[PDB]
Design an enzyme around this catalytic site. Structure first.
Site, PDB file in Angstrom:
ATOM      1  CB  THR A  89     -35.153 -30.164  15.394  1.00 35.27           C
ATOM      2  OG1 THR A  89     -36.529 -30.166  15.082  1.00 35.27           O
ATOM      3  CG2 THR A  89     -34.299 -29.816  14.208  1.00 35.27           C
ATOM      4  CG  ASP A  94     -22.932 -41.016  18.462  1.00 30.04           C
ATOM      5  OD1 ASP A  94     -23.317 -41.408  17.318  1.00 30.04           O
ATOM      6  OD2 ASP A  94     -22.089 -40.129  18.669  1.00 30.04           O
TER       7      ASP A  94
END
EC number: 3.5.1.1
Lengths: 313, 318
Positions: free
Chosen positions: B12, B82
């Site tokens: 989430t 990332d």
């Protein structure tokens, strides 16, 4: 006219032939300083090796210990200027100015940047405010602290930046102004001494990505790496298979230091990675972290001592 | 309210529609329910540092399947920050639709003070349903900004403003759901991409090397031994190798492993006809990408060719 030595590490960027050609190309310099020249190396900066760094640092220390020498300017290729500057920032035992300068365009180009960069570098070298600033890079009318500087663009005349701070000063048609200074220790305050070092420890750099591998860690270990800089994804994150190989490296006594591929920011300490462990390189970049880890490994392989170095310098 | 599917690749990002993760996002940002009919799917459940080509293939196939249907207006993909840039770039070259494909994440966990996930997701839904979002290619929506997948990168380790497009800038803005585009990419994407991954089950191996003074041959050699089909070299300055690494890269290229020169610097083009004799040494110049996006493009190139000239044309086109 203060006495300055120019050390050439390569060709002309605009008593040594390379430095005589600089004086011929930028004759205003002769009105500002009494210039002595030496040729330290004759290479592109992508050809640099730790032997040349040591030769240069030792020679700069010799020169700055002389009463007559006010400052040293080093002409250098742009690709790895940041690494030489950072290495010198930790190994020069003087508060006298040490200025690295280069050119993003060849001296034969239309609109060559070398003449103005070199003219400005000399003005920074002789300026009274330049003392105890640490090693600086002078490019594109800007003065960058060696700790903070990096080449951020492949081609631009404005390629140099200090992405975590910004320039510490300016130099515009030779007018030098400082606005900030580093509070991280440098030069005289540095604990590092290379006067007794012949060869730097091997430190490899790895580039992290999705679906990463163990085979490059393994190859660095087999080749006798004493340290590894991991240029991690985001905030210093490895791919799982790579992290297992790094843990193996750390168990073998190789110091693993986490940095980042991203370009800016701190690779922050994270206890679960580290304090079990790895070193967090904090606000550096992989190639500058490599320099600091090579210097650290000349005196310790202790993770906690090397973490204190990264948290200090 | 238009039909939008949210595909989760991790947990989430903020705080049944078809996925528990997406039910949680709707509970956290209930205003999105007034904007769109939301369907949810969970493609993967990993941090983005654990992404694999297997997941990229699964995600690209599902996005293609959803967008090929008249009932689906857009897709939103929640993703870790990332490697969001790699996934977005992959999808930009493999999704055969002009419908919006919006990647969104959070630099701060949803439990944090001043969590960025709620506003980022709210903004992503507004971008997905906006009429101007069509034929923009895959985008990343972060920090009130719309970035083109070709151009986007995570440039900072921690900042909520970590995403940037260092060679071009954001293509648009989204501010409390108000969407404005100012530019679009002119590099081919999506429908105009030659690449077809519909039948591919495994992508070619492509390693990335980090260049520095006093560099080595041993990492090139290890990549070759591991069966690399390509190598991205993140070179010094304008894509320059250290001589020992150059010899090893030459050996790789000349053995049929494609070597593509990029740069460690962060911006600019790794240009042709600079200091490296690419024709002699057998290399490709990646031009205006970065190493990790060059790796994605090379992996796709390698699905259909290892020819140096054809792959140079690919890098000079996309």
């Amino acid at each position: 006219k203060p006495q300055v030595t120019i050390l050439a590490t390569g060709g002309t960027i605009a008593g040594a032939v390379t430095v005589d050609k600089l004086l011929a190309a930028v004759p205003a310099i002769n009105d500002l300083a009494t210039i002595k020249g030496e040729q330290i190396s004759s290479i592109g900066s992508q050809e640099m090796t730790g032997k040349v760094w040591l030769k240069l640092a030792k020679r700069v220390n010799e020169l700055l210990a002389q009463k007559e020498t006010e400052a040293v300017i080093i002409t250098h290729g742009t690709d790895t200027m940041e690494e030489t500057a950072f290495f010198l920032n930790l190994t020069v035992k003087s508060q006298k100015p040490v200025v690295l300068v280069g050119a993003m365009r060849p001296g034969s180009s239309m609109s060559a940047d070398g003449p103005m960069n070199l003219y400005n570098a000399v003005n920074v070298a002789i300026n009274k405010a330049s003392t105890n600033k640490g090693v600086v890079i002078v490019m594109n009318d800007e003065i960058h602290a060696a700790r903070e500087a990096t080449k951020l663009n492949t081609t631009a005349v404005n390629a140099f930046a200090s992405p975590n701070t910004g320039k510490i000063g300016t130099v515009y048609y030779g007018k030098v102004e400082y606005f900030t200074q580093s509070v991280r220790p440098h030069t005289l305050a540095s604990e590092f001494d290379i006067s007794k070092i012949e060869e730097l420890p091997r430190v490899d750099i790895l580039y992290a990505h999705p679906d990463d591998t163990d085979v490059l860690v393994n190859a660095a270990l087999q080749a006798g790496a004493k340290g590894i800089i991991h240029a991690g994804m985001g905030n210093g994150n490895p791919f799982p298979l790579t992290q297992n190989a790094l843990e193996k490296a750390a168990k073998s006594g190789v110091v693993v230091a986490r940095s980042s591929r991203v370009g800016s920011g701190s690779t922050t300490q994270e206890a679960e990675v580290d304090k079990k462990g790895f070193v967090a390189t904090e606000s550096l970049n992989p190639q500058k972290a490599r320099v600091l880890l090579m210097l650290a490994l000349t005196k310790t392989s202790d993770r906690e001592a090397i973490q204190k170095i990264f948290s200090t310098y």
